[PDB]
Amino acid sequence: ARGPKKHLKRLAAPHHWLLDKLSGCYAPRPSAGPHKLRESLPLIVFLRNRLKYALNGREVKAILMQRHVKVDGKVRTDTTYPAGFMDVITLDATNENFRLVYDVKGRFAVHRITDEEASYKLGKVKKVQLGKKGVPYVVTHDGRTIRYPDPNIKVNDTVKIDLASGKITDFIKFDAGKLVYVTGGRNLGRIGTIVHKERHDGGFDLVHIKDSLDNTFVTRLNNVFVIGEQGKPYISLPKGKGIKLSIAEERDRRRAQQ
């Protein structure tokens, strides 16, 4: 190619979107934004294929141009805006608030939250550095640059950000025993507690996580997201609380409830 691409084939789209393979030939390409293309849920998919409020892309555009949708407290009018992990989506007309958190299966879930919980979000500190004029700042996983951070905040920590002011209200250090959420790999969507961080210089650090059922799994440090102390997450968790269940157990539960 001679420049950036602008089209996305349906078969090439992220699997977790759960798009019909025969509905069309193209899928919404997420516009540039806070979250990476493959880790993001464009607003069209959320409003149409998840909430079912809109029956087609044109109706999604009609909804957005009415300014009814806010992402992290700010109105967005782009159909393919890349909403992503820990993003608060507010619909005032419906009096509804959502937080985009993976379910255990590895797909963004329709998780409703309260207004108080919609006032803040969490962000993994991806970088900490001095800017111009010697003003320290932290860069989080959604591209937010926050100046004058608490000096104790280091990389891999999780900062609680207030959406109204975009200021750090609280922070959580990365340490053993902390409650974490897996945001990548085949263990995506699971919740557990750190046991041990294996450090390899010049390579990828691995973290061993123990879930509530005592199962243990190893994941790269890039996919880990601290969300609180054990049993006391800073956010309301989805149904199932991030616990993986074997196919037989899922069958048993499904038959029991049916």
């Binding site: 349906r10 078969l11 393979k21 025969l22 069309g24 030939c25 074997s246 196919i247 037989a248 069958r251």
Partner: protein, 181 residues
């Protein structure tokens, strides 16, 4: 371009079509069940071969294997639901004991014949293809329709059919009008 839509062959030619014993077996099957051609018999044989190969492969797995348990239970549940496998024979060994006749008996043609709605398998086929047979509230015109155990008790003449309480067909009212005139 749009994504491909999957397709598959529901039958296969047997290894030696010309075996005299095989020819006689196909003749008996077609005559007993009123099958149109050898394609239907090949289709049922292909399904049965697939089922039995799956069962054999599961049996090769060690007992208590999660894959064996899950897949074998699903397969036995399906076979019991369609009626091929009896309730008391819920094991993979009895899945290998199935025969084409078991599947053929479940066809809506044979069931319509057996329930007393038709005087022969061919009369049952004609009744089905002419939209006289309803499984529940749904008219079914496919002789190869495989009747489930629950569906077995709901086969009846369709509400729209002349035999099911609707008005007489075209011939009946035609002759009645000509007699009246």
């Amino acid at each position: 371009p749009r994504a491909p839509r999957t397709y598959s062959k529901t039958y296969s030619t047997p290894k030696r079509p010309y075996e005299s014993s095989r020819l006689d077996a196909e003749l008996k099957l077609a005559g007993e069940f009123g099958l149109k051609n050898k394609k239907e018999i090949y289709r049922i044989s292909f399904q049965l071969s697939k089922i039995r190969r799956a069962a054999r492969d599961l049996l090769t797995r060690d007992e208590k294997d999660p894959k064996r348990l899950f897949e074998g239970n699903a397969l036995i549940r399906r076979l019991v639901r369609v009626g091929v496998l009896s309730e008391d024979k819920k094991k993979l060994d009895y899945v290998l004991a199935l025969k084409v006749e078991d599947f053929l008996e479940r066809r809506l043609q044979t069931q319509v014949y057996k329930l007393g709605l038709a005087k022969s398998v061919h009369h049952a086929r004609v009744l089905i293809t002419q939209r006289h047979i309803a499984v529940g509230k749904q008219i079914v015109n496919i002789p190869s329709f495989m009747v489930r155990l629950d569906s077995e008790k709901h086969i009846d003449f369709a509400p729209t059919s002349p035999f099911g309480g609707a008005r007489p067909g075209r011939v009946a009212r035609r002759n009645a009008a000509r007699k009246a005139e």
